[PDB]
Design a protein around this ligand. Structure first.
Ligand SMILES: *[C@@H]1O[C@H](CO)[C@@H](O)[C@H](O)[C@H]1NC(C)=O
Lengths: 49, 49
């Protein structure tokens, strides 16, 4: 069946490319939402607000 | 059975097995390079892509 499927490598490459694009897009979404600032501030030890 | 000198030649024998390959046909129609799919991970990636 794999030997018969070899002639559909274009289709399967297209599918894998689409899914890879989706995955990279998800990583990009998370980064652009949360990593707005690249200075990791830490809260002061004392709580006087 | 004793009065004979050997030649000065060498040969090599391999063994074909069922394997999937990638081949590159140049502008003149000759094969110039190939990839042994299922040899190492890098060739596997070249073969999948
Ligand atoms: C293809 O054939 C022509 C004439 O034989 C030659 O000039 C040319 O170099 C060949 N192509 C390459 C990449 O060598």
């Amino acid at each position: 069946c794999s030997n018969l499927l070899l002639q559909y490598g274009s289709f399967c490459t297209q599918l894998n490319r689409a899914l890879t694009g989706i995955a990279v897009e998800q990583d990009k979404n998370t980064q652009e939402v949360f990593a707005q600032v690249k200075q990791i501030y830490k809260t002061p030890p004392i709580k006087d607000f | 059975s004793s009065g004979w000198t050997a030649g000065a030649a060498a040969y090599y024998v391999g063994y074909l097995q069922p394997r999937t390959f990638l081949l590159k046909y140049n502008e003149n129609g000759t094969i110039t390079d190939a990839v042994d799919c299922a040899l190492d991970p890098l060739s596997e990636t070249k073969c999948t892509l």
